Amino acid sequence: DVQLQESGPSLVKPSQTLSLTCSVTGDSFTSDYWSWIRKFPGNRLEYMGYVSYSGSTYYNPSLKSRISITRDTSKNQYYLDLNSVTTEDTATYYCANWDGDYWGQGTLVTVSAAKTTPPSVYPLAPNSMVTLGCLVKGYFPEPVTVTWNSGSLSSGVHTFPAVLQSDLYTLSSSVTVPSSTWPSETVTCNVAHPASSTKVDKKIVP
Amino acid sequence: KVYSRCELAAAMKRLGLDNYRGYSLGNWVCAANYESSFNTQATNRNTDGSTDYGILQINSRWWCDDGKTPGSKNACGIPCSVLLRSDITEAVRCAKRIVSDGNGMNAWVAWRNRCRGTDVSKWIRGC
């Protein structure tokens, strides 16, 4: 089947170029047209442009000559280059084919001057169910991922969306388990920050 | 089926071709006149083994699957037979994909030679 996947950086400094790649499976590449769309915060979709095999492109005027969409037909890939980015180009970026049948996964690109700071991870401790949590404080950029007991507690988890305050992010996750199961068995959250290659486990204890 | 001028105009406007990507409705009616004389069952075998189908003479080398065109592509994902229907829905839809390339209506040689640069409003006079 036809499948697409975005790649390229997730953090870009203001004034640099944002360079993304979309890789396509199958034999459709040279027979179709290929697009880039982005979602801003507030569910605002913008159609950035598309390229045909003819070599011709159409770009959104709102992008003011900053955008280039190009093909490499020998490798079934296409590219997005967006010059001179600002914080305003922070968005989730999708590749897709022209009729909308097939889409990539989206990739969140952040545009910011802020440094890559790892997360401080702290435990949250105090009729049958009890709540516990992890506070993930002081990181940049997004995302962080949180699991409990390496995925083995899937249900009754709320992992809240992060908030930015003075160029650092903070997030919390709750987990609700049976009161006979804790402290008896161990409860332990797992926080990864792929930008700082940091991996920390905090076990919850009274 | 052979459409009359105004019958084809109505059908094309209903299927969204009036002012599709800057091309006013008469461009399309004019295109259909000189490509196929408004005849959905028109076919023409080219020397390479491909065939132009339908009212807008769409070619099997790139756009549809007739099963008998060597090294061809089917960009519209349709069998070429569907372009011989009286209902133009599938021809219009494939025509929209074609015209959305940079080349525009240059895709149709008869439009370039006989419609481009003329007053095309005439083709929808009194409908």
Add this chain to the structure above:
Amino acid sequence: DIVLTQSPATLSVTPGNSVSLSCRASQSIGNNLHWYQQKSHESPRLLIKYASQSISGIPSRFSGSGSGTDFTLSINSVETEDFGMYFCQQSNSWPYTFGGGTKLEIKRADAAPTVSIFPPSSEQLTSGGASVVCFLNNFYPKDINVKWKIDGSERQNGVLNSWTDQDSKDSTYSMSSTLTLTKDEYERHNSYTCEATHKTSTSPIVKSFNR
């Protein structure tokens, strides 16, 4: 640039019922209007193309009608899975444009938040910080207030809040509130209180601790 106006911005529905969503175009776009569904942490999925033409794999209960400037997406017998954003999109004129979108949320019976308060860890205090965390989990209808108190006196500054989207299993919402202070400032006071006010009671759910 053609502008697409989607009304209303939000619907809440009990499963089994129907909805109609509206998309209005600022000029005539013929039949060149397409409909998308976007669930959270997912890519848009095409539901209807060219105003009324169906898409292979898409449940029959989704249909589309209209022309010119007024278009309609119908969902007969709504299911819980149908929750998320619905976007229209025109391909009549370059640049292609999207509507602002309509949110479909699932309607359920009310529930009070299960509230939990937490003091700062020993390891955070050692680092100079002191955060107090409150969870208000599994409530409905989403609308909720949280006040923090330090020995009875209400606080505005230093709070950090965060809300989940609707849960796919139970249709409840959840909030997080984080009061961050310095270790010197934390140790000048005794009581810390997480007060939560919700539609279910006029009396707020209170959770407290001392040092």
